Amino acid sequence: PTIGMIVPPAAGLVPADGARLYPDLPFIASGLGEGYDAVIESVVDHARRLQKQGAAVVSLMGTSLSFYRGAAFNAALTVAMREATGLPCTTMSTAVLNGLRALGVRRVALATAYIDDVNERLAAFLAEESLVPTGCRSLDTATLVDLCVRAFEAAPDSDGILLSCGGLLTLDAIPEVERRLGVPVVSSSPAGFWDAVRLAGGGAKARPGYGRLFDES
């Protein structure tokens, strides 16, 4: 089944992680190219576009876009996508909750590429959904790996790490961080793929090597 992704950039490319994680799967993207009315309408518009292109399911593949306004908005936007489209729909924030929960992570450390105000909305989203945010640190693989280690060492009681940057190239850092700390890392972009592949069904597995998430069915 084709998996449709609504992507933040105007260019509307399938995010680069897809070619590494799921080379055998058909993905298509529609680029969205601030302001809840404008977000709701473009998102519904672009979901219909992917439906028209033959998507079997649709993921809103931006974490900030989907958690900035809280957990209730994420939930309601998903339903509006589904009602416009007739397809199972999801978001990168839901993908993150699903991955954290699959991995038994309740107390979560934050490693992100966001400003303060956005990191605050992230931790608020997670606590709304009854996870426990602990440490937060925010900004290549070397810098990403160090980011998460500094996130974890700032809060050693964490069950795992949320690496939140759906725009960044993160797949090399995840295994290296899990290898070094022994704790799982859920990252936005890979998690959004993992979640969208699950949603679509069929049961395909990711290429080996990209972290503990991908051993979760």
CATH number for the domain that contains residue 185? 3.40.50.12500
Experimental resolution (Å): 2.1
* Whole-angstrom distance, CA of residue 184 vs CA of residue 177: 8
Q: Judge contact between 166 and 192, C-beta under 8 A.
A: yes
Sheet strands side by side (includes 27-31) = 27-31, 3-7, 57-60, 89-91
> Obtained via which technique?
X-ray
Total domains in the fold of the chain: 1
The one-letter code for the residue type at 103 is L
Find the length of the chain: 217
Q: Tell me which residue range forms the domain holding 86.
A: 1-217
Among 141, 213, 148, 140, CA closest to 177:
148
User: Which residue is associated with the tokens 């998460």?
Assistant: 148
